[PDB]
Amino acid sequence: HWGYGKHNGPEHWHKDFPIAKGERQSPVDIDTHTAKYDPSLKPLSVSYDQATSLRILNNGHAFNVEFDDSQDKAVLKGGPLDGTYRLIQFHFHWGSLDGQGSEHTVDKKKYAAELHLVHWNTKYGDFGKAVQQPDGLAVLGIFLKVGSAKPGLQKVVDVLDSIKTKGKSADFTNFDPRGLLPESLDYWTYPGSLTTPPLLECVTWIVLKEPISVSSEQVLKFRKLNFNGEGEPEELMVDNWRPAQPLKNRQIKASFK
């Protein structure tokens, strides 16, 4: 089955998921010299004050921090979006080396990692219906660089030894995702897809311009996770990123001059 290994990585995914070669695939390279400022874009509204995290899960590809999405507790609105999008989970993609790990690139620059905060459009009632719609999801993408530690990330780092291997989960309540946001909410936006199978073209991407910093020690603990299950030969969970896909007939818009 699909993964990021020597024989099942991104270049193979099209065989089981033909939409991998579709018209609106993600991630993409963001060319800052051709993305155009769109004055019709409105301020992004990130409302995470009532967010209720529940659990953290190693799913064999990444780890997900999961939220209670049965009410409007943690929502994204504004920006390019119409309506209200509820936070369901976040996860990361990262590298084996600090010079790779992000999915989106900026003028071909790869960051050390990328955080995806996944939200679904409440007009479709549940996540599974939302992913069947072109405007079903909004993903907030945030780049990570290695430098100073991110205090807001340490609770996540802290818990990873308890979910080392595929299939392990742990309680993870009262985590505040506001502590993962940069200062500025300046962003680029374009229409795209999920970056893991099933690669559905249901996402309004909102990629923040300003990266967050994490420390080398924080990243190193991500790189101790395992793709494998308990009792199986160890395969470190690294380089769990899809490379940039063709932009095709899309435009990337900037919220800022």
Q: Residues comprising the binding site for substrate? A: 195-196
Q: Which one from 14, 33, 61, 119 is the annotated catalytic residue?
A: 61
Contact between 19 and 200 under an 8 Å Cβ cutoff? The reply is yes
Binding-site residues from annotation for Zn(2+): 91, 93, 116
d(CA 68, CA 53): 6
Identity of the amino acid at 51 = A
Binding-site residues from annotation: 91, 93, 116, 195-196
Buried b (16+ CB within 10 A) or exposed e, 182-198: eeebebbbbbbbbbbbe
Contact between 155 and 95 under an 8 Å Cβ cutoff? The reply is no
d(CA 26, CA 250): 11
Tokens of 226: 């395992």
Is there a catalytic annotation at residue 61? yes
Phi-psi region at 233: left, alpha or beta (left = phi > 0; alpha = psi -120 to 50): beta
**Which residues are part of the catalytic machinery?**
61
